[PDB]
Amino acid sequence: TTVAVIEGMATGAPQRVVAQADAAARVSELFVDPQQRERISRIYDKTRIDTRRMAVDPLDDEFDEFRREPATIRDRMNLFYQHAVPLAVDVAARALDGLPYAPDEIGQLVFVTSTGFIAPGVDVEIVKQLGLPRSISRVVVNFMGCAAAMNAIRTATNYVRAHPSMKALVVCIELSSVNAVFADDINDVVIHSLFGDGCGALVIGASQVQQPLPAGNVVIRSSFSQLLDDSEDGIVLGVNHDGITCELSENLPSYIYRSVDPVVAEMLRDNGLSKADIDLWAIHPGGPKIIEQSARSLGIPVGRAVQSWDVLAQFGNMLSVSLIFVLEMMVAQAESDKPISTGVAFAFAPGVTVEGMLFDIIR
Amino acid sequence: TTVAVIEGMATGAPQRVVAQADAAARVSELFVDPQQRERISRIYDKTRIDTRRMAVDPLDDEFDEFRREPATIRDRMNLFYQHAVPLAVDVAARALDGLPYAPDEIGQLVFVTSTGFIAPGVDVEIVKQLGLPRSISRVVVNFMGCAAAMNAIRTATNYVRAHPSMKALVVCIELSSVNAVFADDINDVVIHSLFGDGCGALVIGASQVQQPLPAGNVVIRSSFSQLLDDSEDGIVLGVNHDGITCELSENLPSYIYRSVDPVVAEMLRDNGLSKADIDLWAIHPGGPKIIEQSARSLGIPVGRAVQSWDVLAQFGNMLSVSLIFVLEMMVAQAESDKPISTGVAFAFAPGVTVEGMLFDIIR
Ligand SMILES: CCCCCCCCCCCCCC(=O)O
Numbered sequence: 243t244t245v246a247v248i249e250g251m252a253t254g255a256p257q258r259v260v261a262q263a264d265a266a267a268r269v270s271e272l273f274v275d276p277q278q279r280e281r282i283s284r285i286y287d288k289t290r291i292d293t294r295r296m297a298v299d300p301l302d303d304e305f306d307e308f309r310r311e312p313a314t315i316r317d318r319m320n321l322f323y324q325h326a327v328p329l330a331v332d333v334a335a336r337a338l339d340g341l342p343y344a345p346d347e348i349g350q351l352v353f354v355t356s357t358g359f360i361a362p363g364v365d366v367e368i369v370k371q372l373g374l375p376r377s378i379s380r381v382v383v384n385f386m387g388c389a390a391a392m393n394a395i396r397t398a399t400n401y402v403r404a405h406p407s408m409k410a411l412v413v414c415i416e417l418s419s420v421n422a423v424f425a426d427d428i429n430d431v432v433i434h435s436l437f438g439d440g441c442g443a444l445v446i447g448a449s450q451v452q453q454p455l456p457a458g459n460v461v462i463r464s465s466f467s468q469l470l471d472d473s474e475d476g477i478v479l480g481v482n483h484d485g486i487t488c489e490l491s492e493n494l495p496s497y498i499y500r501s502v503d504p505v506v507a508e509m510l511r512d513n514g515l516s517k518a519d520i521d522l523w524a525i526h527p528g529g530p531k532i533i534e535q536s537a538r539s540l541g542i543p544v545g546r547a548v549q550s551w552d553v554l555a556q557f558g559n560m561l562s563v564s565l566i567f568v569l570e571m572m573v574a575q576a577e578s579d580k581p582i583s584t585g586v587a588f589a590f591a592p593g594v595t596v597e598g599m600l601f602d603i604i605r
Numbered sequence: 606t607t608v609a610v611i612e613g614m615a616t617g618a619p620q621r622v623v624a625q626a627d628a629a630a631r632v633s634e635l636f637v638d639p640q641q642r643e644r645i646s647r648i649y650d651k652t653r654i655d656t657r658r659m660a661v662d663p664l665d666d667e668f669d670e671f672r673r674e675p676a677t678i679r680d681r682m683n684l685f686y687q688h689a690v691p692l693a694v695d696v697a698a699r700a701l702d703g704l705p706y707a708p709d710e711i712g713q714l715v716f717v718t719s720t721g722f723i724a725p726g727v728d729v730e731i732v733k734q735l736g737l738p739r740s741i742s743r744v745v746v747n748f749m750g751c752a753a754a755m756n757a758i759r760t761a762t763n764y765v766r767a768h769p770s771m772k773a774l775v776v777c778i779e780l781s782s783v784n785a786v787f788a789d790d791i792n793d794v795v796i797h798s799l800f801g802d803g804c805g806a807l808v809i810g811a812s813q814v815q816q817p818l819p820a821g822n823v824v825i826r827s828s829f830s831q832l833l834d835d836s837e838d839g840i841v842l843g844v845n846h847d848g849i850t851c852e853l854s855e856n857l858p859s860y861i862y863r864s865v866d867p868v869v870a871e872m873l874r875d876n877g878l879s880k881a882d883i884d885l886w887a888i889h890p891g892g893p894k895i896i897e898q899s900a901r902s903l904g905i906p907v908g909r910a911v912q913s914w915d916v917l918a919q920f921g922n923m924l925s926v927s928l929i930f931v932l933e934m935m936v937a938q939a940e941s942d943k944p945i946s947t948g949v950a951f952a953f954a955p956g957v958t959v960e961g962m963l964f965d966i967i968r
């Protein structure tokens with residue numbers, strides 16, 4: 243009878259732009275070994291990141307000494323809150339603005355992050371400051387990683403199709419900068435070169451199938467998941483005494499290489515399509531190997547997913563948020579004379595799990 | 606067209622029973638003051654708890670010294686994992702056992718906890734060890750507190766009604782014992798006297814309304830939420846360097862007193878019933894003030910919610926899990942000759958939010 247649709251959308255990020263050249267220079271200062279300082283310069287170079295938005299400054303000496311201290315986890319969580327509320331309120335609002343709905347119509351808020359833990363959290367502030375119904379259904383989704391926006395979209399899809407008349411509001415926000423530390427190990431150095439801050443927001447609504455939908459609407463055709471074997475170590479998320487971390491496996495790129503195509507293939511098979519029918523590839527911009535290996539698993543030229551590279555270059559990895567950016571860019575660039583430019587988004591989660599969705603943008 | 610139903614259900618807990626008399630004695634030893642040692646004895650007495658199940662021992666001197674140490678948060682999270690996987694796997698299985706369905710029918714797993722953070726986490730192990738489809742949709746719900754099973758049920762309700770043919774599996778597990786510490790403050794002493802360990806599991810399925818449903822089925826009539834004003838401080842959840850905490854306000858009981866009736870009233874009004882039509886009150890057994898004040902807000906004798914007191918007495922507060930226990934007891938005790946014994950469950954979440962549901966048990 244029915245099918246889900248993105249009716250509004252928006253993005254935001256901390257004002258502070260941080261040039262990768264500076265970050266690399268600032269980090270290189272610290273190591274002062276011939277091999278060590280060299281290794282670091284090389285790592286930052288390979289990231290394909292020009293800038294990241296960061297709510298906390300790596301410039302301030304006052305923040306420097308705090309980052310050194312042990313047992314600060316709780317202060318960082320409060321700091322996530324202190325910076326996230328205005329950002330998330332602002333972006334949620336912008337997603338709702340220019341829509342013809344009463345707040346009474348907004349029946350779900352799915353809040354998403356893997357970079358702060360605190361309750362009552364940001365989700366409550368969204369409903370208070372935006373004036374959403376206090377009877378709103380809420381779901382807080384945590385530690386589902388870079389791919390968490392797919393899990394959130396899937397959840398909102400189920401809401402609006404089960405309650406046609408109502409809308410679902412999804413908000414993702416990630417403040418990696420809040421969890422920044424000094425490098426105990428190689429993985430610390432790598433992680434701290436990639437992750438940035440950002441938030442994104444989506445309003446989802448139902449639709450009777452074969453309605454003349456608005457232009458700019460994105461239709462959630464289908465969603466998909468695959469939990470993989472032999473790749474528990476791929477993406478790991480933890481809570482340390484001095485911050486939340488993500489620990490990546492050296493083998494993650496080959497995990498991704500071996501898993502992307504068959505998963506995406508099977509999805510297309512069950513949807514009755516081919517790589518030929520896909521105009522857009524919203525590969526999560528987690529890093530250069532993540533895009534490269536996704537693309538080389540599929541049959542596609544690396545640089546085809548141009549929005550993914552663009553977002554990585556400008557923002558870095560904003561975990562769950564990145565794919566919202568990718569999608570907003572894709573809606574902006576009407577790159578075809580076709581009525582529906584259709585695409586596939588996917589990302590990777592601890593498991594390893596491949597999460598994604600097929601969608602048609604209504605031009 | 607349709608409405609949701611609980612088709613299977615199960616509970617479990619750490620083997621180790623801890624008598625409150627011992628716990629109180631063990632904790633009283635630690636303070637050596639006339640007022641101090643006295644105050645503590647009084648607190649434990651007031652809890653209305655005989656026993657709690659605990660995955661970690663308060664007996665072992667080896668565990669004693671670890672509980673003292675700072676910055677152990679990450680080890681505790683791994684410890685949550687080490688103990689949660691078998692429990693959660695076992696209970697999820699038992700919820701599924703004695704059911705006709707193939708694993709291909711299980712399309713959602715909503716995993717719930719506010720007492721450990723780790724990825725890849727327990728949810729992945731449920732699908733691996735239970736052999737559930739790897740294409741299963743997952744949602745991990747964290748820090749939604751004692752009431753999180755209502756948020757999870759609601760979410761599963763939306764899944765099965767949006768995908769009639771499939772089932773949703775909900776698993777809640779809470780291991781407070783993992784987060785145990787030495788008391789920095791009065792609230793630490795109070796918290797450590799109430800919270801225990803437990804898990805529960807639910808299989809939810811769809812149904813065409815006016816089907817002769819099975820006996821023992823519980824029908825999710827409706828769910829409800831209310832985010833309150835001026836009660837941010839009521840229930841607070843945080844992540845410290847040496848464990849996750851919950852900080853309760855002295856005013857929480859009056860927050861509950863002032864909010865339960867109008868919220869529950871309005872729900873009944875929108876469902877067209879009265880307190881008269883409610884045969885069962887599944888008040889979250891968070892503590893004696895929580896039940897007492899809920900009951901005195903509503904028009905009901907305190908001791909009416911007998912399952913709530915029973916569960917508190919035997920297990921303590923197992924946050925999200927407790928209401929599953931309450932419901933399992935209620936299904937067990939067929940207390941009426943009526944065909945449908947109907948009830949209301951609710952609980953309290955950081956916000957403060959009142960979350961709950963109306964249900965008819967098909968007897
Ligand atoms: C999913 C958890 C993400 C954990 C983030 C830890 C790393 C934060 C990196 C923030 C950028 C800091 C770079 C710098 O030191 O200049």
Ligand SMILES: CCCCCCCCCCCCCC(=O)O
Pocket residue numbers: 628629632663719720781782784785786796797798800801842848849850851
């Ligand atoms: C939602 C977070 C709850 C944090 C719970 C921390 C304390 C749990 C108490 C476990 C019982 C410890 C035994 C005792 O000292 O009596």
